[PDB]
Scaffold this active site. Structure first.
Site, PDB file in Angstrom:
ATOM      1  CG  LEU A 119       2.673   1.497  -0.115  1.00  0.00           C
ATOM      2  CD1 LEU A 119       3.722   0.818  -0.969  1.00  0.00           C
ATOM      3  CD2 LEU A 119       1.336   0.791  -0.242  1.00  0.00           C
ATOM      4  CG  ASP A 120       2.290  -1.258   7.463  1.00  0.00           C
ATOM      5  OD1 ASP A 120       1.882  -0.515   8.378  1.00  0.00           O
ATOM      6  OD2 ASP A 120       2.921  -2.314   7.680  1.00  0.00           O
ATOM      7  CB  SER A 121       7.143  -1.058   7.472  1.00  0.00           C
ATOM      8  OG  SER A 121       7.261   0.236   8.018  1.00  0.00           O
ATOM      9  CG  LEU A 122       4.337  -5.339   7.910  1.00  0.00           C
ATOM     10  CD1 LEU A 122       3.165  -5.903   8.702  1.00  0.00           C
ATOM     11  CD2 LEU A 122       5.591  -6.163   8.133  1.00  0.00           C
ATOM     12  CG  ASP A 123       1.664  -2.187   2.468  1.00  0.00           C
ATOM     13  OD1 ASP A 123       1.112  -3.301   2.546  1.00  0.00           O
ATOM     14  OD2 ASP A 123       1.126  -1.129   2.850  1.00  0.00           O
TER      15      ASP A 123
END
Ligand SMILES: CCCCCCCCCCCCCCCCCC(=O)OC[C@H](COP(=O)([O-])OCC(O)COP(=O)([O-])OC[C@@H](COC(=O)CCCCCCCCCCCCCCCCC)OC(=O)CCCCCCCCCCCCCCCCC)OC(=O)CCCCCCCCCCCCCCCCC
Ligand SMILES: CCCCCCCCCCCCCCCCCC(=O)OC[C@H](COP(=O)([O-])OCC[N+](C)(C)C)OC(=O)CCCCCCCCCCCCCCCCC
Ligand SMILES: CCCCCCCCCCCCCCCCCC(=O)OC[C@H](COP(=O)([O-])OCC[N+](C)(C)C)OC(=O)CCCCCCCCCCCCCCCCC
Ligand SMILES: CCCCCCCCCCCCCCCCCC(=O)OC[C@H](COP(=O)(O)OCCN)OC(=O)CCCCCCCCCCCCCCCCC
Ligand SMILES: CCCCCCCCCCCCCCCCCC(=O)OC[C@H](COP(=O)(O)OCCN)OC(=O)CCCCCCCCCCCCCCCCC
Ligand SMILES: CCCCCCCCCCCCCCCCCC(=O)OC[C@H](COP(=O)(O)OCCN)OC(=O)CCCCCCCCCCCCCCCCC
Ligand SMILES: CCCCCCCCCCCCCC(=O)SCCNC(=O)CCNC(=O)[C@@H](O)C(C)(C)COP(=O)(O)O
Ligand SMILES: CCCCCCCCCCC1=C(C)C(=O)C(OC)=C(OC)C1=O
Ligand SMILES: CCCCCCCCCCC1=C(C)C(=O)C(OC)=C(OC)C1=O
Ligand code: SF4
Ligand code: SF4
Ligand code: SF4
Lengths: 55, 82, 176, 185, 114, 115, 318, 156, 43
Positions: free
Chosen positions: B38-42
């Site tokens: 996952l992305d950090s924003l996820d």
């Protein structure tokens, strides 16, 4: 300047001022639309001597 | 909010309602960056889904270190009684 | 060298107090305003009957552009591009070449009237009095591209309005 | 047109919807007349309405395609709907009371001649009755929007854009997702 | 190389500010869809916010991402307060523009730009 | 009888000037022409939000002074009585009580608006 | 043959409204050193016909946020109450001779505010909301003297019958014993009828158009002609109150011509006040009718109760 | 035919009532609005032609775009034009409203209001004189005079 | 030479101050007129 003196007197009384002496509508007292051709003067550098531009 | 099991099942319920995580890999000790990918924003919108569920404002310094559902249920248990 | 506007203290004798109280209760300055408005009711209005009567203009007036000719039929524009070099909005576009008798003339002389700012730098920069900004101001169009004048439209404006543009330049040219 | 201009691109749209259509606006405006009457409850006819910018991109991609000369295209939307739940989705986006009722075929053309006696643009006609109650035929042999590179837009993206106008203020600002979609076939 | 910060000493406080700003946009998007009565879904607007955040994801300078947080908060204040209109919010959705040619062959076909 | 005919006529050709106002011209309805007017930009919030009344104490005291012209209004008729000094004393008592009420509403700054 | 009498009442007092629009524009023009309309008809005499045809062939535009039922009911009730306040007015004979015609005028003034008020509420706009609650703030200011002034003037009449008010003023005008009441009633009718300096509801400079800012043409026509019917009726009513003329029972047209030219002079007076004054702030409106006109109105009410008793000049109620 | 004569006279009636009762709106942008006020001034006097301002778009007939249309106000211009009921008209006054004008190559200026609204009369000048603006208004009246609305309805 | 110039004696004197000419009656006269009109109406 074509108003009757009854309306002129009523108008002067209502405004409280003399209005025919100072009319805001212009008539034959203004300048003519056709003027004589002018002769405009020249400046101080329009000379033929002692007119070096560096000076 | 009463017992830890309801909190853990509710965390996993919100994380399987979350669509970018495949629920087949979703275990309680699964990581988000290196396991689920996952992305950090996820993870940030995961934490905001947790605030939509549980209803208390999670700060930034203690939500950065929430990298698995076990850390999430342990932090909710730390901020509660259970 | 300065004056105090609104630094008047009112008089406090019984005469002026009764006068201001009659002004308040009996509305004297309101009747003054009504009297001045009624005074303008009985005047001749300044409404000129357009389109039959026209607002007064001068021979310096800057209206529609026109390309002028010499008094032999030859056009004046010798393609020198000062009018598009001084144009503050870049409304003038000039393309030129020697025409069939070797004369320096333009092939393209475009004035975008919807960029033009009507300041008349082109008519004062023109060394041969070719481009002028004539007296026409009633040239509103119903479409935008009719206000993008080519060389043909500007020469037709000159041929249309020459009998007035020559007289206005004759009236003003000593001031220029 | 095919016989007097053989290289013509002839395009078949199904039923085009947009802001200025007479398809979803028409389905909207029978909250004025009554309870939106339908032949056989509007469940024996199937429609696949196509969005207008899909048709427009199809026309322009048919202009740019030299391979579209002499073809015959069929521009349809991606989803096929029965007429009943199509009208039900129209009345669900606009949040109007949807209460349909069966009107028979011999009597819903008398309503059609009742509104075409106007000298103005008529509100409906018996021809429009016949064409709302004509099923959109399936012609798989003709190329479509997918063969000109036009991705067909479904109704659930543009129906809010069409039908926000027909809402009252008390449900004027509700969103695109605040509705259940219609049933496809 | 001794420069003066704007808000962040290093990239940790900077990423904290980027993170808080994405939180604020994520909370804002349903209201932006609602009261501008936009005809997009809430997921579509949130993906546009994710795209506008991932566009700047290659910066390693704390001052530049401080200014990006600043300008994002300015656009957020223009969105919370109704100072943008429907046009200014839908200008992030380049919808009237054609899909530009991407490969070499179609850019060769249409024109001269590399 | 004549009053009902006159009111029906006025209401009828006030509502027949509206039904020939809506049905006679040509409409081009689209969902931006019927948008709320807020001088060109989109309105922030609804106009159904609370619009706080500054003149609220004057608004209440209008309800207590409007009853006075349900009380002071029989005075053209009350002057026709045969106990007239009593009537005059009670009438001046009513206008005096209205005036004392208005004086008290002045002196506590009740006629001023808030903020 | 009463329906013909209703039509010959209410159709000429629509044509009078129509040509009051032209008289307003031309008297307003000549007081502003310009001309009014003179192009459309011969010296503008066909301009109101062009305005009346124009507003009913323009698109009506019911808004999206408007509560439509009150939105349509507001101009209907506007023009209905504008027409129906002409029926107790004696001309020298009223259409409907009411024993309490003054209270009919007052109550149908109080009901005419809801046209402006429901138009401002129903058209769900912010400027319309401001224009509606400024009508609230204006009506609670003028109604608290509009009844006491009209009470004090009828203590010399004896009743609330407008036809008796001709008999009351058979010797002297009723402006001679009651000129403070007259000059206060005149301002109360300026503030009643939303005319300048007390516009305050269709505020052109504070608001955009106030209550009728959403009303496009057609429904906007029925607020505008209602307002002008209100001002002509209100000057006819002011003329009947304070400038009542000679009535011959065998020659009614003499009285009709006389109060017609008097009410026309008061209509020109409204146009001449609207052409000369700045506009009040609508609290200074309220600090005028409450702090200035209301104490003096109570004082004159005491005086006009006690004075027919003081001089044995109580008028008859019959 | 008789019906063509009847719809021709009714076209003449509605075109007369629309060109002789033009209500522009209080809407200026820049220096041209000063001259548009001079067209309202007692010398040229729009009100003799039936031309009088109404501040609301709902009760206006023509929008005189008098001044410079920037990018920041172009949606406000479009929504103001949209809130005018049909028939509505646009008179473009001055060079900046016509084609961008003296700010044509600017980053912030819409190059002519005809990118935003359909424009009927283009009035040229920087500014055009109030007499030239009144000429454009009377040309708009002549454009309304030759409309054929009911004739084209009768023939379609 | 010829040039737009003022005349030899210059232009005339130009008024530029306030002239609000103080018209009307006094206060006591207007109250006397008003009270006299009241007394006539009352009689
Ligand atoms: C007050 C009631 C009206 C009395 C008549 C009136 O005031 O006539 C204007 C007349 C002239 O007024 P003015 O402003 O001094 O006009 C000067 C112009 O040079 C005079 O104007 P002019 O030099 O241009 O003279 C030509 C003018 C001559 O003007 C007239 O004939 C005036 C109209 C008289 C009828 O005729 C026209 O312009 C044609 C006008 C056609 C329409 C007239 C419509 C009048 C209303 C009846 C319907 O007024 C007076 O003489 C004072 C009022 C007298 C009242 C008497 C008692 C009543
Ligand atoms: C109280 C004072 C005012 C009273 C009312 C006004 C008096 C005059 C009444 C008749 C005026 C003429 C008809 C109304 C105006 C129609 C305007 C219009 O756009 O018409 C085009 C329309 C047709 O428009 P269209 O069909 O061309 O549509 C164009 C618009 N699109 C394409 C977008 C849909 O014509 C009519 O509606 C005809 C109306 C009746 C014509 C006369 C019939 C006989 C009357 C005797
Ligand atoms: C109906 C026929 C015509 C009638 C006349 C009206 C036509 C002329 C109209 C002119 C234009 C007016 C347009 C609107 C103007 C609005 C402003 C305005 O008027 O404000 C009111 C102004 C307000 O004044 P103000 O606003 O300056 O007050 C300041 C107040 N403080 C100090 C609190 C800030 O005046 C009044 O309120 C006076 C009301 C009328 C007074 C009548 C008194 C009569 C005399 C009584 C007796 C006196 C002696 C005592 C007893 C003696 C016994 C022996
Ligand atoms: C007995 C006779 C009948 C009396 C009862 C009937 C009254 C009829 C009129 C109704 C009046 C209702 C409202 C009255 C309010 C009075 C109180 C008041 O307003 O006081 C404040 C005022 C100064 O105003 P201020 O506080 O500065 O306000 C700021 C905003 N303007 O303060 C003042 O201006 C001072 C007020 C008091 C002094 C007035 C003197 C008048 C004298 C006239 C001659 C004598 C008359 C006989 C009565 C005795 C008077 C002392
Ligand atoms: C209580 C009193 C109330 C009064 C209300 C009315 C007040 C105003 C009265 C009318 C004033 C004058 C009106 C003039 C109208 C135009 C006259 C004219 O010249 O029209 C010419 C026009 C075009 O004709 P064209 O062929 O171009 O002419 C070339 C000439 N060689 O051709 C036309 O325009 C065609 C003909 C149209 C005629 C219309 C006339 C006006 C009708 C107004 C309606 C009310 C009439 C009165 C009703 C009550 C009394 C009976
Ligand atoms: C939803 C919003 C509303 C939509 C619809 C709006 C409809 C129109 C609303 C405005 C009109 C309201 C009328 C209210 C009643 C008025 C009564 C009246 O005019 O009374 C005055 C007059 C008094 O005269 P009097 O002393 O009786 O003399 C005869 C005896 N010698 O009386 C007479 O001369 C007596 C004559 C007969 C009177 C009959 C009784 C009154 C009939 C009332 C009808 C219904 C009223 C509806 C009110 C709605 C208010 C919004
Ligand atoms: C409806 C539409 C509304 C549109 C909304 C527009 C929002 C535009 C705001 C743009 C603000 C930015 O882009 S600031 C981001 C730049 N940050 C950086 O360069 C630092 C690196 N940051 C990141 O990678 C961020 O993803 C994180 C989350 C802070 C760290 O993640 P990485 O670790 O994995
Ligand atoms: C049969 C009834 C016809 C009614 C005609 C209503 C339309 C006319 C409005 C004219 C008008 C007037 C009188 C007016 O008072 C006014 O204020 C100065 C205007 O400009 C804002 C106007 O446009
Ligand atoms: C009623 C008299 C004529 C007014 C016409 C106004 C039309 C709109 C012009 C815009 C404008 C307004 C409102 C205005 O008030 C103003 O201030 C002087 C301007 O110049 C900066 C304007 O440009
Ligand atoms: S008048 Fe000025 S802007 Fe116009 S073409 Fe000439 S130089 Fe250019
Ligand atoms: S300045 Fe005059 S001669 Fe030179 S290019 Fe321009 S118009 Fe032609
Ligand atoms: S065209 Fe020119 S003078 Fe006119 S408003 Fe624009 S900048 Fe000002």
């Amino acid at each position: 300047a074509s108003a009757t003196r009854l309306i002129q007197g009523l108008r002067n009384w209502a405004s409280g001022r003399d209005l025919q002496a100072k009319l805001q509508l212009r008539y034959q007292e203004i300048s003519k639309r056709t003027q004589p051709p002018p002769k405009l003067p020249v400046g101080p550098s329009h000379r033929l001597s002692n007119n070096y531009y560096c000076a | 909010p009463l017992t830890l099991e309801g909190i853990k099942d509710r965390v996993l319920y919100v994380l399987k309602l979350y669509d970018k995580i495949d629920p087949e890999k979703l275990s309680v000790n699964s990581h988000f960056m290196k396991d689920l990918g996952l992305d950090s924003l996820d993870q940030v919108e995961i934490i905001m889904a947790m605030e939509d569920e549980f209803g208390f404002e999670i700060p930034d310094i203690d939500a950065e270190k929430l990298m698995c559902p076990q850390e999430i249920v342990d932090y909710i248990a730390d901020k509660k009684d259970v | 060298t300065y004056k105090y506007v609104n630094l008047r203290e009112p008089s406090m004798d019984m005469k002026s107090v009764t006068d201001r109280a009659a002004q308040t209760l009996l509305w004297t300055e309101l009747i003054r305003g009504l009297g001045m408005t009624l005074s303008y009711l009985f005047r001749e209005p300044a409404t000129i009957n357009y389109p039959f009567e026209k607002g007064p203009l001068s021979p310096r007036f800057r209206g529609e552009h026109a390309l002028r000719r010499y008094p032999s039929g030859e056009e004046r524009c010798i393609a020198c591009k000062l009018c598009e070099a001084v144009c503050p909005a870049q409304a003038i576009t000039i393309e030129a070449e020697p025409r069939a008798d070797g004369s320096r003339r333009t092939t393209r002389y475009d004035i975008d009237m919807t960029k033009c700012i009507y300041c008349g730098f082109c008519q004062e920069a023109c060394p041969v009095d070719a481009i002028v900004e004539g007296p026409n101001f009633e040239f509103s169009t119903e479409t935008h591209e009719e206000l993008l004048y080519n060389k043909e439209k500007l020469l037709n404006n000159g041929d249309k309005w020459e009998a007035e543009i020559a007289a206005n330049i004759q009236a003003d040219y000593l001031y220029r | 047109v095919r016989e007097t201009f053989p290289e013509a691109t002839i395009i078949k749209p199904a039923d085009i919807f947009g802001r200025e259509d007479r398809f979803l606006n028409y389905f909207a405006n029978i909250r004025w007349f009554g309870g939106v009457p339908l032949i056989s409850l509007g469940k024996k006819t199937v429609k696949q309405p196509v969005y207008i910018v899909d048709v427009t991109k199809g026309i322009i991609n048919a202009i740019k395609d030299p391979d579209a000369r002499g073809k015959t295209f069929a521009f349809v939307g991606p989803n096929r709907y029965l007429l009943f739940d199509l009208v039900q989705y129209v009345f669900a986006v606009a949040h109007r009371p949807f209460l349909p009722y069966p009107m028979p075929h011999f009597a819903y053309r008398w309503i059609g001649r009742l509104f075409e006696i106007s000298p103005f643009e008529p509100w409906t006609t018996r021809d429009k009755v016949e064409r709302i109650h004509t099923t959109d035929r399936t012609l798989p042999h003709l190329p479509g929007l997918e063969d000109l590179g036009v991705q067909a837009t479904p109704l659930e993206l543009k129906a809010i854009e069409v039908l926000r106008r027909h809402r009252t203020y008390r449900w004027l600002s509700s969103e695109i997702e605040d509705v259940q979609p219609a049933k496809t076939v | 190389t001794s420069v003066k910060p704007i808000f962040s000493r290093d990239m940790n406080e900077a990423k904290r500010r980027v993170r808080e700003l994405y939180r604020a946009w994520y909370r804002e998007v349903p209201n932006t869809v609602h009261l501008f009565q936009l005809d997009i879904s809430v997921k579509q607007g949130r993906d546009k916010v994710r795209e506008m955040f991932k566009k700047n994801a290659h910066v390693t300078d704390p001052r530049v991402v401080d200014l990006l947080v600043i300008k994002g908060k300015m656009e957020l204040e223009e969105t919370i307060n109704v100072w943008k209109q429907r046009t200014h919010v839908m200008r992030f959705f380049h919808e009237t523009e054609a899909p530009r040619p991407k490969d070499f062959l179609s850019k060769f076909y249409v024109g001269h730009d590399p | 009888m004549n009053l009902m005919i006159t009111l029906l006529t006025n209401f009828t050709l006030a509502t027949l000037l509206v039904t020939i106002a809506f049905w006679l011209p040509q409409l081009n309805v689209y969902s931006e022409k019927t948008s709320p007017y807020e001088c060109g930009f989109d309105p922030m919030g609804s106009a159904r939000l609370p619009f706080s009344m500054k003149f609220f104490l004057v608004a209440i005291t209008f309800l207590l002074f409007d009853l006075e012209i349900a009380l002071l209004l029989p005075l053209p008729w009350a002057s026709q009585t045969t106990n007239l000094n009593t009537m005059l004393t009670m009438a001046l008592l009513l206008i005096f009580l209205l005036a004392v009420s208005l004086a008290y509403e002045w002196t506590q700054k009740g006629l001023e608006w808030t903020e | 043959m009463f329906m013909i009498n209703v039509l010959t009442l209410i159709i000429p007092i629509l044509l009078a409204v129509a040509f009051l629009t032209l008289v307003e524009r031309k008297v307003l023009g000549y007081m502003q050193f310009r001309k009014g309309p003179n192009v459309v008809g011969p010296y503008g005499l066909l301009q109101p016909i062009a305005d009346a045809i124009k507003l009913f062939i323009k698109e009506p535009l019911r808004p999206a946020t408007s509560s439509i039922s009150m939105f349509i009911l507001a101009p209907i009730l506007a023009l209905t109450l504008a027409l129906t306040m002409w029926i107790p007015l004696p001309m020298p004979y009223p259409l409907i001779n009411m024993n309490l015609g003054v209270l009919f005028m007052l109550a149908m003034s109080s009901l005419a505010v809801y046209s402006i008020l429901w138009s401002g509420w129903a058209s769900n706009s912010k400027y319309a909301l401001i224009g509606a609650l400024r009508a609230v703030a204006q009506t609670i200011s003028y109604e608290v003297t509009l009844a006491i002034i009209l009470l004090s003037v009828l203590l010399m009449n004896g009743s609330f019958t407008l036809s008796t008010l001709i008999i009351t003023q058979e010797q002297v005008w009723l402006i001679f014993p009651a000129w403070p009441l007259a000059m206060m009633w005149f301002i109360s009718t300026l503030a009643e009828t939303n005319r300048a300096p007390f516009d305050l509801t269709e505020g052109e400079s504070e608001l955009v158009s106030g209550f009728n800012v959403e009303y496009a043409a057609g429904p906007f026509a029925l607020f505008f002609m209602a307002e002008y019917a209100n001002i002509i009726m209100m000057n006819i009513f002011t003329t009947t109150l304070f400038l009542g003329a000679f009535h011959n029972p065998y020659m009614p047209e003499l009285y009709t011509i006389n109060f017609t030219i008097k009410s026309l002079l008061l209509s020109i007076t409204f146009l001449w006040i609207r052409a000369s004054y700045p506009r009040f702030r609508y609290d200074q409106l309220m600090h005028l009718l409450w702090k200035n006109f209301l104490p003096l109105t109570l004082a004159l009410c005491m005086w006009h109760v006690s004075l027919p008793i003081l001089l044995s000049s109580i008028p008859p109620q019959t | 035919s008789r019906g063509e004569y009847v719809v021709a006279k009714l076209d003449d009636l509605i075109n007369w009532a629309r060109r002789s009762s033009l209500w522009p709106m209080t809407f200026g942008l820049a220096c041209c609005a000063v001259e548009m006020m001079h067209m309202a001034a007692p010398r040229y006097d729009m009100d003799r032609f039936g031309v009088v301002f109404r501040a609301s778009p709902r009760q206006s007939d023509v929008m005189i775009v008098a001044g410079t249309l920037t990018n920041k106000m172009a949606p406000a211009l479009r929504k103001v034009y949209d809130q005018m009921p049909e028939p509505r008209y646009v008179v473009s006054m001055g060079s900046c409203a016509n084609g961008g004008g003296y700010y044509h190559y600017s980053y912030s200026v819409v190059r002519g209001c005809d990118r935003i609204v359909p424009v009927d009369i283009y009035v040229p000048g920087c500014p055009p004189t109030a007499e030239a603006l009144l000429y454009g208004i009377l040309q708009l009246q002549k454009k309304i005079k030759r409309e054929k609305r009911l004739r084209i309805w009768y023939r379609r | 030479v010829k040039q737009d110039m003022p005349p030899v004696g210059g232009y005339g004197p130009i008024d530029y101050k306030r002239n609000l000419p103080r018209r009307g009656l006094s206060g006591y006269s207007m109250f006397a007129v008003g009270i006299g009109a009241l007394l006539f109406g009352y009689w």
